[PDB]
Structure formats: C-alpha cells, structure tokens
Amino acid sequence: VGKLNKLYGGAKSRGVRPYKHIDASGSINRKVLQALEKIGIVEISPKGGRRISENGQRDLDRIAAQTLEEDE
Amino acid sequence: ALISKKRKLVADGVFYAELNEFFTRELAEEGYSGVEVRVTPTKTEVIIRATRTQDVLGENGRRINELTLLVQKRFKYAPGTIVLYAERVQDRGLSAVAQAESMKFKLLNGLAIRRAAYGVVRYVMESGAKGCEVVVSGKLRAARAKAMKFADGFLIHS
Amino acid sequence: QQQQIIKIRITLTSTKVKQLENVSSNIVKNAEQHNLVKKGPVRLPTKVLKISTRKTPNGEGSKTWETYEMRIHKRYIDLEAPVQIVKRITQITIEPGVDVEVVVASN
Amino acid sequence: GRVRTKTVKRASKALIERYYPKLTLDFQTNKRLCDEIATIQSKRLRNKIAGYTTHLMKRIQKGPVRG
Amino acid sequence: AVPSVQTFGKKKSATAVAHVKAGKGLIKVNGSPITLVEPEILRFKVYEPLLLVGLDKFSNIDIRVRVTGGGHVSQVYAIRQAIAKGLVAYHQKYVDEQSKNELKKAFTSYDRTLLIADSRRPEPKKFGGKGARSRFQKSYR
Amino acid sequence: ENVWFSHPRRYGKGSRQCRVCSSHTGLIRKYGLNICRQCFREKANDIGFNKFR
RNA sequence: ACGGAAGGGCACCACCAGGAGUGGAGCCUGCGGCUUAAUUUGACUCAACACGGGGAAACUCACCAGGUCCAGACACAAUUUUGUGGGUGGUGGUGCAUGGCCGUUCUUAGUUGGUGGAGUGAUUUGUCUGCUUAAUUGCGAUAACGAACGAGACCUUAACCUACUAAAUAGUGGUGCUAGCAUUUGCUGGUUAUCCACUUCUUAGAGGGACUAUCGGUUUCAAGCCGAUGGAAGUUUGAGGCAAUAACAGGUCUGUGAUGCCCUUAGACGUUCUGGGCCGCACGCGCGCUACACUGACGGAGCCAGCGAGUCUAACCUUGGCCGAGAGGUCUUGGUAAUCUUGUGAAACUCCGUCGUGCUGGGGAUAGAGCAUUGUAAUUAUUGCUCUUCAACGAGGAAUUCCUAGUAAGCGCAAGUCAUCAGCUUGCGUUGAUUACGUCCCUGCCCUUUGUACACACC
8 A cells, every 4th residue: 555545646736836746645555455455355464464365256257258349 | 783784895995085185185294105005814814004104103102002992992892903004115115196296395395487497307217107198287476377387208198 | 502603794994004914914814813714805996875075166267186085994804703702803903993784694 | 180100100010020921810829929028018009009900910811011 | 515506698788598498389388478569659660670580570580588687678679680680690590591591691781780789788987987978077276 | 151152053053163274174964974065075085096197 | 478470280168950948937156235233254257156165053153142251481569360472362463474285277188308410699400391090199301419397107988707625695407395277397485503515696816808800992011991890898908097397376284282373361452151143135147947738647576786774872763554535653673784774776758538729627945724853952944744725837038057878867765065955966777769970160179380579578
C-alpha cells in the first residue's frame, strides 16, 4: 500500500507554484484492503506483503479463460 | 563513542590540514620542511627532521617541554610512542622548500639589492638548481604597488 | 575441529603510508619469522563508495580550484594462512582503523 | 583540424634515417615496433603515433618524399 | 576440490547459463509467454525485427532465457534485436544462403540504430564532478 | 556585579556565532565546523587535490 | 592606439533561414525618493541588477527603547572613585598610508631571449610573398641559424577484455520441495556460520582502439574534399580541465593585530542587555512562471537514473500496522549503518463511457471559517489540509535573450541552501525532432598595408 498510494498519487498546484506529485489517500486504501481481507480474497503473507487466496486463484486460472473465450 | 563507518575515514583531512597550517604560520624559524615519519612495527616511533638541528635541540627543554607533552596530552596515548630526539640527517638542503627557507633568511637578514641576489644565485648554483623563477609584489619604495620578477633558466609556463 | 581453518577474510585497509607499510611489513615479517607459506599480497582497485560532505553552494564565476579526492588503499592477501594467525594479525599492532569483514571464504 | 605538426616529423625523420629497412606497411608492426624503438610516456601519444604510422605508410605508398 | 564450474555465459548486459532447451518452435518457457505485451506505442517497432524479415521464422529456434539484471527498458530494447541477430545470422546453418545474403545486403543500407543490439553496460563514475552538458557548480571569492 | 548581562542562547542564529575570526558567513553546521568560506581556503589539504579534469 | 581607409579570416554572447520567449494580472532583487529610531552596507556597460550563501522571526539585527552600564595598568584632591597621556575601543574607515584571492585582455591567437647581421641609435631579421582550417598548423623559399610556451606539454570522457589462484548485501544450472497450475522442473525459503564456487552487473588497475585507407579528381602532392564507412570511437577522441605572454587607480583596508594613518577607558569609538523593524510604498527597470484548451477528469500498467545526513550528549529515526476528509498521531524497527528511515523507486504519457469553450470548466501572486505540524516564539497570514463568487489574460506593441547527437524545447524528481520557509544551480528521465552549413550586411574579434597634429594613447 505504501507504493499503491504513491502510484495512485497525482499532481497538485500550490497557487503560483509548479505542480507537484503528491501521494493519494491511505485511509481508503487500508479500508478496502481490510475489507477484502475479511472477505477472504487477499491475505497477509509472511516476510511482508500480501498474497492471493484460493478463491482468487480459482478466479485467475480457469474461469478467466472461460470468460474471455465467451466474450471473444 | 567517536567512531563512524565511512565518514571520519574521509573527514580526517581537516586534522592534518590544521597541523600543516599551524606548522606553516608558527613553525617557520626552525625551517619546517616535512615530517619524515617512520612507524616501524613493534616500536611505534614518530620522529622529526630539521634543517636547524642545533636550534631544535636548543638549551634542552624550552621547546621540548611543549613538544613532548602537547602531542600526548591531546589524545592520551600511553607513553613511549611519540618520541622527540633529533640526529644528524643527510640531504636536508635538496628541496625547493629548502631554497625557499634559504631565500627567506637571505631576505630577512637585510642585505642590499645586489648582494642578496648574487648570494642566492650562487647558493642555488652550488645546490645544483639550474633554474629559478621568482616574483615579489608590494614595493621597496613608498608608492602605489610594484611587481618585480626574475627568471633564470626557462620553465614551462605552467 | 581442533586447529580449525574457517578463513575469516582479513580485509587490509589503510589510509596513510606510515600505517600501510606498518601493517604490510608486520604481516610479512610475521610470516618470515614463523615460516608461513610463501604467498604475498597485491593491491586492488580500492572499494570506494561515494560519500562526502560538500560545501560548494552556488555556481558563479570561473574555476580556480582543486579536486576532492582520497584513496583508502584497501588491499588484500592471496595466501593460505591459518585463521589463528589471521586473528593474531588483528591482535598485534593495535591501531584503531583496520577493519576485518567476517567472511568464511578462503579463495 | 586534420593537419599535421612537426612533433611527429622530428621523430619520423630520425627513425627512418636510423632504420630504413624497418617500417613495414601494417599498423601493428609499425606501432609495436616504434613504441620500443622510441620510449613513449603517453597513451595519447601512442594512439597519435599509431595514426601517424598510418599516415606514414600512406606517404610511403605515395612514394618519394621531397627532402 | 571438485572441478565444478558454473557454465557462465555472456549476454547484452547480464549473465546467462549455457544450456539451451531445444524445441518445436515453442516461444515460451513452460509457464509463461513473453511476446503477448500489447503496448499501444512500440507495436510496429517490435514487428520490425520480424514482420519485415519473415512472419513466423520460428520453426527451428526458441528463446530459453531467465536472467535478472540490466534493466526493463534495456530488456525491451535488447531482446528483440538479439533474436533478430539470432534469426538472421545464427540461422546461417539453417536458413537459405541467398536469402540471408539478401537480408544482410538489405540491412547494410538499414543500419540506422534499428538493427543494433544494446551493448550498454553499467559503469560507476568518480566523486568530484557531476556535469554532463551544462556547466559545473563553483562559487566566487 | 552585573545581573542583566545574561541572555537566552541555546539555538538559532543568535546563539551560535562563528569561531573563525568573528566572520560574517558560514551557516553550515557540518560536523560542527561552522567554518567560513575564506576559511575553507585557509584550510590547506582538505579538498582532495588532483588535476586531470 | 585609432581610422566614419583598403584587403584577408572567424563568432546562433552577429544573421537572407526561422523557433522558445521577456517587455502583457504579477512578484521574489538593488537603485533614488517619502520615509519611522533604523527601514544597514559594497558596485554602476557585451565586464552590477536571483550578486556578496543576501530564500535574514531578539548581539553577523549595524536602529532605537537608554535608567544601558564603570567593568582600564601607571604621579594624584582623603571603587584612579568625575580629569590626565591612552591598555586596543577600531568591531568608524578608503584597493588611494598594504599584499592576497577572483574577473577583463582568452567566441581568439600570440609571446621571449643567444648568435648572425642592417639601422655608424631608437628598433628590425629571426616572428613569412602565397596556399588550407579549432590554432605560430604543413609546403615553400629566402640574414638566416638553431630553442621553450597558448594547442602540441598531461589525464577523466562516451555504447570495453571468455581478463584480474580480487569480498555472504547486485544471481543464474544441479536446484532443499513446490505454499501459484502442485504430473506443462525456470522460480517463490537461495530451510538466518542458512545448495556450494565466483563476478557475469555493486569495488575498477593494466596493456590495448579509428588512421582519410584499399579508390579517383579537385594544390605540381606538400598541404586538404567526397562517397562502400568501416563502431568500446569518420565531428582529431563528442564533453572537460592549464587564468602563456604582460597590464587593469577593477570587488575584497569592513578580508586573519595587513598599510609613514584622524581619537578615546567612565559620557569605554556603546563590550553587553527587555524586545522588536531590517518584506512599509506615490514609481520603473531584471532572470523565474500559474492560463488565454474540448489539452479538465475517473480506471489501470506507465517506476528504465549514482545523487544525501545520523544521538555521543539532543531530533535522523520505520519499510509495514492502525485512526482520520486530510497537516497528521503510536510499535519489533536506525547510533556506528553497502547494513537501518535506503532493499531512494523521477514524473503528467495511449484509452473509452460521460459531462463537456468560456470570460464558466482556464486557473487562484486575490478574501473568509475550522483541522495541526518544525520553531520559546508562526504577530506584519513560515507552513499543508475541507469549503466558499472569481477580478487574470483571448497568446501581450516599440525594443531585447538562447538555439545545430546524448540536438534547443514542454514535463517531474535527486542534492546544496534546511529547525521550518523554492520560482536559485547540477544530473536524469518521457519525445528525443528543427529553420540553418553560407555570410561579413548589423554586431564585435584577429593578420597585412597606409596616415595621424593621439601617446593619462579619438571620452
């Protein structure tokens, strides 16, 4: 999330000054991350970081191929 | 504490810089040339060579009382590692800084315009320096400003 | 084992010649007086990580200046000596400033 | 810019007067022979006299020199 | 003790292992393709090493590499030219001789930094000077 | 005998003055030096001298 | 030296050729003025005005509030106690009672003797009639001969070695099984003296490349032009550094007690102290940008660059967790750190559903309410955050700056200045593209001739 809010940052003006890149919100990022943690898609992995749970792994491999073969 | 990884190992320049400027702006009458330090293993010995060995010996204590105690009271070495005994050493007068001390003495003793001149050129000849170039700013008379100069033997410029 | 050979890499690092000649003459005379294997050292392209505290704020005028440069003469020894004498080289000739990286690697 | 100087000639005339049967046409035989005929204390002088040996074999295959 | 060597091999700006996996034109390594990228900028630039040279031209060559080093921009701007050299030059054992001769003669008048592999290597610079194009940073007095 | 010659001096430009010559520059606290610009030139051998570039 | 005389040769701080602009709402900078006790001072041309760290919140703040305060050694009328010549009080002061350091002559090459002679001296030959440029660079003849310096005298450069019996932070086969599919072995921890060796990228020391050569003419080849261009280099090897010759009433006497200098210690030539102005504007000058679009927006990959500090007696201290609309607030984690805030991650780029060009979406140097940070200190808003009508220009005249491979130019980050206060400089990135290869027409700069009543030398 420390890089997610950065990558979602944007340009802001300090009046008669140039535009500076500034980080995005952290509150909503933490809240949606916790929401999906409670739902059980994302999961906190060892050594620092998040991994994908088995519902998301099943959504990744087979049904993605099925959905794209349907809509293509 | 007084320890850092790769900061003081490079910032140590200021110490011997202060040492060098102090030796230049105070240790001038002795003819301070350079510290021929030789740290032998199993016997840490820090010596000094002088072109006026009679003067750095002196009356046995007036210079030594400061010279042996100030180099130790500052950093608190154990005794017997920064030792001050001066001996007869060769090739003391074979350097540009030695010619600089010689012409300093020849300028300070107060000879006339030609006597110091042929004296210094005979001395640099007998030392074997085949060329010199010197400039003196300021003045001899009481006027605005002057810059005298003479160069014997042609040098690359610069 | 008894009389272990783990070969902690002794990292010869000096700044001045008075200490460089001191430690190099020390280790080679030690090898000479207790008859170590005849394998001597050579220098290196020194391990310079660029760090310094510059004090040149603003760029006006022309350059009548020097170069900020310094050589930490980090050298090494290509030999097969015991870890015992590798440790005793650090024990004797006490001068704070010589670093020894704990590295279990002989060659 | 693409002009020559007397600094190469003062060595060139001497080395050919010394070693007429030397100066084979090839660049490395010129260079690795001249560097040990004449001591050089500069890598840029080494590269420049390499180039000048190329100029020299060009002048030799041009033919007789005026002097 | 044992003469165990790691088969060190060279690449554009990184290391490699010298054990190639032969195949039947499978441009992948067993769990992931690379070529499906869809950048929306460099599409014709990546089609240039292949579309002008021959459409498939992979019936007798695969790329089997895993290296961590160099850079991503160097990777995108190097691997395509690398396999271009592999398919135009290393294929001299396989491709038609007159075809590759025609190709080299066609590219002699095309060497305009489009068929040049990135031979860049990282290099450190020394502390004391920073300028590249503008002037340095010095004070008066 | 004076009571009012003290004054708060702990931080800021009013507390710390130069030590070089009662100089008028050098607001640089690098390694506690606070040394002047003419003073950096009075310093002899701290530049790391060598000339090729 | 000059020439408003002639010839020859160069410069995108000169342009038939144009592009990016200032001068337009505007300020950060000093001037002169009103100035309050002060709004402290230096300098006036391509050679100051974003310069003197000068982007100043209580001694570099020099100005007052003034009851400031007696705090020197040495004859004195009976804490030298009012007064003495002056211990320093110069911290009142000039580049003009002194040097030193930088700049100008250095967008263009010129400099010096010793011999030989000529000038019955100043001086001249050497230092050049032509012929080519980044050059006194090569041919060539000569009162010429043989010698150093500016380039040549040196090294860092830019896409460099199957290379160095060099190091566990940058990694590769076999892999220690697979936790993503676990049968389609690359991998997830390299099972915390951790699957071993080492550099093949973190640390760079050597010798080595490219030279107009193999072609022909453009000089008689003795210079030099082309294209097959040959790549660690066809522009000398792109960009960088030697202040060479000898001078400047040039910035530094207020820079370190640096100069034959005017005066004092009780009313100190004010050392210090309660604080605050040092950003006040009727005015113009100068480098720096926020817009004058369907180019304003959601969603995402767009992230490929070394840059810099750390208690050692006071503030650098979390990558991650948690609360918040957000300044922000607390913990294994960082004082000897390639090691921890640092595993530095530099930014808007194409897209379609929709609103949507207008003085309205194009924005905020303008004014108001609340949320808190660094600093005793946020007063004459230091600063970021939630909201509120936008005045501001329809691309700004006369005049004036930069511009030919990492091509100017639009854009954002790293470092110095920083406790907090960038529009100030260097390096990178995204696109990496011109309108130019000739000129002396304006501007200046070097060589030759010529005249001069100038030589503190056309002010």
